[PDB]
């Protein structure tokens, strides 16, 4: 049978799901979480052969290795080895929608392994195989004999091989189907891959064994007392002499213990579970677990005879914490959480969907170092070690069933169909059975983007019955359905409603108070971090802090899903959708991360870090008020560093230990300060530093900062007179001005500064001209495609209005000689097909000091779409090593994404002034700049700028960063005004009105001089 | 004047525009719009281009779509504006026939002027003296005092047009909301007026930093810079250019800097006492009634013309009053000011208004006081006992620019 085309068959001969087992035969090894000789890894070198369909696999393969097979590492995704292409499709299914069928051409991966089994494992007990992740369905044979079948790419499939193995050499044969009926429930927005991509292991358990165990922790009103209850079930030989002992340890100290024979309480007219027992341990003043202080105990579950023989022991880390929603709030240990979350897919640019310890650790450290305290398993159960790590390092986790049917029409077509209830049930039930004892999991989710079907209602209820300790959430069907304890919208905006029919996305503040609504609201996805984005992030955090029931959200998402490809020369480059021949595909939509695929941060990460700070500050005179947002810890590893600088020049600084209780406040009065007579703005910067290293950070890590303008002394100082007056020389074509070793040339036909000489060296490669456009950001383009234009997208509106192709028409160009200067005045109009879009009027005043003051006044037609920027640009002849500026930094920052930036004097290598987004766009801007130095030039004013070796035109025309080529000289874009970048979503215009350039008239001024 | 703002915000019909399409939504819960008709009018800079009427027939909570006819192109630069009004044709127990119950405006196409003026018939002359820079053009003369740095006199023929020089102004006669409960006997230092007093805003004096004159090919250019200081602190710096051309227009550019640590000022504008008094005030901007940045929704952009006294609001407790915002052109006597500003014009100085507690004791001063603002602070009112002006209506930008053209009519 084609079991893979039948949602009624999701496995054959598969064992029951359960929490992590290791079958230790020594309790102290279980207590220590040391390795168990009864749990072996079969990871390593396997044999593999690719077939275009299951019908192409030859029968001999069951009995022996195929000579044409290759040896490959397992776990792996076979696309990563090049056998076939990975596919990047977002919502549309990668296969024709015709449930429950799949393509007859269905890539089949034939894996095999010859391995050893010691006779002792076969003398007694049971030997099972466990495949933690096989995508998407597979048949298993052992020594040529058929064992079983499994579906659900994201949970372990276990089979008993006791009767199939023999001492010594044994051979497995695993026929993995890329497509199966399971694929209809696996439509998440990620690369479509396949293979044995999680661990493979062999577990020996005794015949009489622990088959499942559940640990719960309940508390008294103030959490000073708890009862740990552990229900343990056994399989096998039930006899009066059996007992279960559960002991709880805090380090090497045993804090509690209980022993009991099997036989639970009477449950009904037929009696009780004679194969189960519940132990209850009282624990006084338990050390509570939270993401802030991940206190853990170790519970050891010993199955043994009453007279003392340990049969086997299992164990887990226990976190004493209670999760509950009360009065509309999600509370953890009685206090309301504020979720600083992020969605994280399991993605590696070289290994595909294969996860490894190092990578997970690296992600958890960076998450924590960036003030995240929570992660959502978008959109499936994760590799088992993830949970261990979030339990130990401390992150709150939303564990999510592997159910996504986004591409159906309507989206709940399968989820409302009872015939798909069984397949969906398994995805929910087996997840809970496996991950229910992990303290890090605080909320269960029913899956993602599958509409709202009666199957969801049924399953919501199942979990609520089986595990009352955690809320259940689910966004489908409008995010506030009867299948969710939490209003958990994706991309609902802070103030702006989006009233789509049936599944509107209300402003999050308005959503909480709709008639009859009382649940807490935590966005399952917000702040779509695709390319240059995170514009508006601060607006979310301000609302979250202000409204109790607004408890946070999970950013979409942590890491770009880019894959490495190699060029002719063998140099790696970041690839996205369609780069593997895959089509249809969704191009760069797979890259939405705060960090690049190699974990390098994108600039948005620092904005998230800042807004997600755990300390808030207020300044009043010289008193700094620090407020802690921690709920359970005191600031026992923190000091406050403060510094005052006058326009970047350090004046005074100090440090003060921070001692604030959770939710407490501390006042810190600063020293009498410098009141310098010298002009400039005084700026106070404070930073919270952690003096001691932690499990997740190095000594000196900075966890928070904030700045305030202090006193400002405006300059009233007159510049001395210049022993010199610039001279003007005219011709029909140009106005030339000379002053000392300097020269300026203004073209009378174009109306622009066409060249400048310092000494006798030319300084420009292209003239200085106004610029009203930008190489569009992913958020400017949204879903627009050549093939299917989205006229509402910003890029399309600019295109259709002619912004990118408008030509400057000269309206006026004059030159006048003043007392001590030459003044050039110009006016230009930009038109498109008869429409005047913008008018630029300027004056350039060159004085005897050699400075050139430029004043620009622009008019923008009120009926043209608001332009991306209002600025000047030019290609400088010079290429210099560094860029030094007095303004916001040091990282890239945009109008709606600049809270993290601090005003100071910064100095970086040129290359740092470019952000290598995989899909190129306008990037590297720095705002609020008062002075910029590059080579011999200095520009002063109040502007935003970018500077790099790549023109806006080049960036707009190139689809991949590795294809960009440094141009001659350096392109400088200096903006009086720049539009926000948006990001509430990446498929509809999202730039907030206050960040759109709609004033109609704009004024800016700069002084360009040397040094 | 606040009543009209209330009337507008409390309208029972909401409107949206999409193309030629106007969508009217009824906020009535029970009645149909059985005594209402929609009147629409399109004007270019105040000049009527077209209009019409359509009967309204909307059920409670329902919507009605109205298609406007093809809008003939306009022959001239300018901004087209669409205004709609809901008029009740029949009298009711509480209103007369013709009662307007709701209105809304939208900007439609705008055609920016790219038409080069025309070569001045003459060239103004600059006369420089130890104490002044004078400019003469035809029968007009402008005088800039070199020690003060301000335009101190302007003549049409032998007629002086100013009583006081044209000077920057950063303060306003305090509103009730600016005062709050502060009292001479019990100052509320948190009130706006007290912050401004304490910072020296009302006492700061202009110190000249620069005053130069240059002649250009067709114009004379005066450049000035002043600092306003208090107890040795620089509160504001105003830099300007006055460019007088062959046409007789005086183009004034103003760039101001406001120290970041001083309380945000009540306004950033210029003021002067005009020598003459005129019967009417005519402007192209928002009106017709008094309107402020945070209280201007009800006002409409059009060409308005009122008697000068309608330009003063007789609040019992006098204060800054009578401003109109969003003004592109203002006409008074033979004078015309063009730009994008807010203004008030009356027989009372801000000084008098702030020194007078009851309207009945104010007395018309000689000439007319004109306050013309590039920017003006919101008036607030969420309450009148604590600062209530929203951040977005505070003049906190630090650097401000505005430009005006003063010419004769
Ligand atoms: Mg099946
Ligand atoms: Mg023992
Ligand atoms: Mg034996
Ligand atoms: Mg999806
Ligand atoms: Mg496509
Ligand atoms: Na909150
Ligand atoms: Na995506
Ligand atoms: Na501390
Ligand atoms: Na591009
Ligand atoms: Na009617
Ligand atoms: Na008064």
From Swiss-Prot, chain A:
Substrate binds at residues 90, 189, 449, 525-528, 592, 987. Changing residue 189 to F: Obliterates all binding and catalysis. PROSITE patterns: GLYCOSYL_HYDROL_F2_1, GLYCOSYL_HYDROL_F2_2. Binds 2 magnesium ions per monomer. Can also use manganese. Inhibited by phenylethyl thio-beta-D-galactoside (PETG), isopropyl thio-beta-D-galactoside (IPTG), L-ribose, D-galactonolactone, lactose and 2-amino-D-galactose. Pfam families: Bgal_small_N (PF02929), Glyco_hydro_2 (PF00703), Glyco_hydro_2_C (PF02836), Glyco_hydro_2_N (PF02837), LacZ_4 (PF16353). GO terms for cellular component: beta-galactosidase complex. This is Beta-galactosidase. GO terms for biological process: lactose catabolic process. The record marks 345, 379 as: Transition state stabilizer. Changing residue 345 to D/F/L/N: Less stable to heat than wild-type. Causes significant destabilizations of the first transition state. Coiled coil: none annotated. Belongs to the glycosyl hydrolase 2 family. Its EC number is 3.2.1.23. The keyword Metal-binding applies. Keywords: Glycosidase, Hydrolase, Magnesium, Manganese, Metal-binding, Sodium. Homotetramer. Induction: By allolactose. Its cofactor is Mg(2+); Mn(2+); Na(+). It catalyses: Hydrolysis of terminal non-reducing beta-D-galactose residues in beta-D-galactosides. It comes from Escherichia coli (strain K12).
Swiss-Prot record, chain B:
The chain holds residues 616 to 1024 of 1024 of the full protein. Substrate binds at residue 385. The record marks 385 as: Important for ensuring that an appropriate proportion of lactose is converted to allolactose. Belongs to the glycosyl hydrolase 2 family. One of its GO terms (biological process) is lactose catabolic process. GO terms for molecular function: alkali metal ion binding; beta-galactosidase activity; carbohydrate binding; identical protein binding; magnesium ion binding. The keyword rRNA-binding does not apply. Induction: By allolactose. The keyword Phosphoprotein does not apply. Keywords: Glycosidase, Hydrolase, Magnesium, Manganese, Metal-binding, Sodium. GO terms for cellular component: beta-galactosidase complex. Homotetramer. This is Beta-galactosidase. It comes from Escherichia coli (strain K12). It comes from the Bacteria. Disulfide bonds: none annotated.
């Amino acid at each position: 049978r084609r079991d893979w085309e039948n949602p009624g068959v999701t496995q054959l001969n598969r064992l029951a799901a359960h929490p992590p087992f290791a079958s230790w035969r020594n309790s102290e090894e279980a207590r220590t979480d040391r390795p168990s000789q009864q749990l072996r890894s079969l990871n390593g070198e396997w044999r593999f052969a690719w077939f275009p369909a299951p019908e192409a696999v030859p029968e001999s393969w069951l009995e022996c290795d195929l000579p044409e097979a290759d040896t490959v590492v397992v776990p792996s995704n076979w696309q990563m080895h090049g056998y076939d292409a990975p596919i990047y499709t977002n919502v549309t299914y990668p296969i024709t929608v015709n449930p429950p069928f799949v393509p007859t051409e269905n890539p089949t991966g034939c894996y095999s392994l010859t391995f050893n089994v010691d006779e002792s494992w076969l003398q007694e007990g049971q030997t099972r195989i466990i495949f933690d992740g096989v995508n998407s369905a597979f048949h298993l044979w052992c020594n040529g004999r058929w064992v079983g079948y499994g579906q659900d790419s994201r949970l372990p499939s276990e089979f008993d091989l006791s009767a199939f193995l023999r001492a010594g050499e044994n051979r497995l044969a695993v026929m993995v189907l890329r497509w199966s009926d399971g694929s209809y429930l696996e439509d998440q927005d990620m690369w479509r891959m396949s293979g044995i991509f999680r661990d493979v292991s062999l577990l020996h358990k005794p015949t009489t064994q622990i088959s499942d165990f559940h640990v719960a922790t309940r508390f008294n009103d103030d959490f000073s007392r708890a009862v740990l209850e552990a229900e343990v079930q056994m399989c096998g030989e039930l006899r009066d002499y059996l007992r279960v002992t559960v002991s709880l340890w805090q380090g090497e100290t045993q804090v509690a213990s209980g022993t009991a024979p099997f036989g639970g309480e009477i449950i009904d007219e037929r009696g009780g579970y004679a194969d189960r027992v519940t132990l209850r341990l009282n624990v006084e003043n338990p050390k509570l677990w939270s993401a802030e202080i991940p206190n853990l105990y170790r519970a050891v579950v010993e199955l043994h005879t009453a007279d003392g023989t340990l049969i086997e022991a299992e164990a887990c880390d226990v976190g004493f914490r209670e999760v509950r929603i009360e009065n509309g709030l999600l509370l953890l240990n009685g206090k309301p959480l504020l979720i600083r979350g992020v969605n994280r897919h399991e993605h590696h640019p070289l290994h595909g969907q294969v996860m490894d310890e190092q990578t997970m650790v690296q992600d958890i450290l960076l998450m924590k170092q960036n003030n995240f305290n929570a992660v959502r398993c978008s959109h499936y159960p994760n590799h088992p070690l993830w949970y261990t790590l979030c339990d130990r390092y401390g992150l709150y986790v939303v564990d999510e069933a592997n159910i996504e049917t986004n591409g159906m029409v309507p989206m709940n077509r399968l989820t409302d169909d009872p015939r798909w209830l069984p397949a969906m049930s398994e995805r929910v039930t087996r997840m809970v059975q496996r991950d229910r004892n992990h303290p890090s999991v605080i909320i269960w989710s029913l899956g993602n983007e599958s509409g709202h079907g009666a199957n969801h209602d049924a399953l919501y209820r199942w979990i609520k019955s089986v595990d009352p300790s955690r809320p259940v959430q689910y966004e489908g069907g409008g995010a506030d359905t009867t299948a969710t304890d939490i209003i958990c919208p994706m991309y609902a905006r802070v103030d702006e409603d989006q009233p789509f029919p049936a599944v509107p996305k209300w402003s999050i503040k308005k959503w909480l108070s709709l008639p009859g609504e009382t649940r807490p609201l935590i966005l399952c996805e917000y702040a779509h971090a695709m390319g240059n984005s995170l514009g508006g992030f601060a607006k979310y955090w301000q609302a979250f802090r202000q409204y109790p029931r607004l408890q946070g959200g999970f950013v979409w998402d942590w890491v770009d899903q880019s894959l490495i490809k190699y060029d002719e020369n063998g140099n790696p480059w970041s690839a996205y959708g369609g780069d593997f021949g895959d089509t249809p595909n969704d191009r760069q939509f797979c890259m939405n991360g705060l960090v690049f695929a190699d974990r390098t941060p994108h600039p948005a990460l620092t904005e998230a870090k800042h807004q997600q700070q755990f300390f808030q500050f207020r300044l009043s005179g010289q008193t700094i008020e620090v407020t802690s947002e921690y709920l359970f810890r005191h600031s026992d590893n923190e000091l406050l560093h403060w510094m005052v600088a006058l326009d970047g020049k350090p004046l005074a600084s100090g440090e003060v230990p921070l001692d604030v209780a959770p939710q407490g406040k501390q006042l810190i009065e600063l020293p009498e300060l410098p009141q310098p007579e010298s002009a400039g703005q005084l700026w106070l910067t404070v930073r919270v530093v952690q003096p001691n290293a932690t499990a997740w950070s190095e000594a000196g890590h900075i966890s928070a900062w904030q700045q305030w303008r202090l006193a400002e002394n405006l300059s009233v100082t007159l510049p001395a007179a210049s022993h010199a007056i610039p001279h003007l020389t005219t011709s029909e074509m140009d106005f030339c001005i000379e002053l000392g070793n300097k020269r300026w040339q203004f073209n009378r036909q174009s109306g622009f500064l066409s060249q400048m000489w310092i000494g006798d060296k030319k300084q420009l490669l292209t003239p200085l001209r106004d610029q009203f456009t930008r190489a569009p950001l992913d958020n400017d383009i949204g879903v627009s495609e050549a093939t299917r234009i989205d006229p509402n997208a910003w890029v399309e509106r600019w295109k259709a209005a002619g912004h990118y192709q408008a030509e400057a028409a000269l309206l006026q160009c004059t030159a006048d000689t003043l007392a001590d200067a030459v003044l050039i005045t110009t006016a230009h109009a930009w038109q498109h097909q008869g429409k005047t879009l913008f008018i630029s009027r300027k004056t350039y005043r060159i004085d005897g000091s050699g400075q050139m003051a430029i004043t620009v006044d622009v008019e923008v037609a009120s009926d043209t779409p608001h332009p991306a920027r209002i600025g000047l640009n030019c290609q400088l002849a010079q290429v210099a090593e560094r860029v030094n500026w007095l303004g916001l930094g040091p990282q890239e920052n945009y109008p709606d994404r600049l809270t993290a930036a601090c005003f100071d004097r910064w100095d970086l290598p040129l290359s740092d002034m470019y952000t290598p987004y995989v899909f190129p766009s306008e990037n590297g801007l720095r705002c609020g700049t008062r002075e910029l130095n590059y080579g011999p030039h200095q520009w002063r004013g109040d502007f935003q700028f970018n500077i790099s070796r790549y023109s806006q035109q080049q960036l707009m025309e190139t689809s991949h960063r590795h294809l960009l080529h440094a141009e001659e000289g350096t392109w400088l874009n200096i903006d009086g005004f720049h539009m926000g970048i948006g990001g509430d979503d990446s498929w509809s215009p999202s730039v907030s009105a206050e960040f759109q350039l709609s004033a109609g008239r704009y004024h800016y001024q700069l002084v360009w001089c040397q040094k």
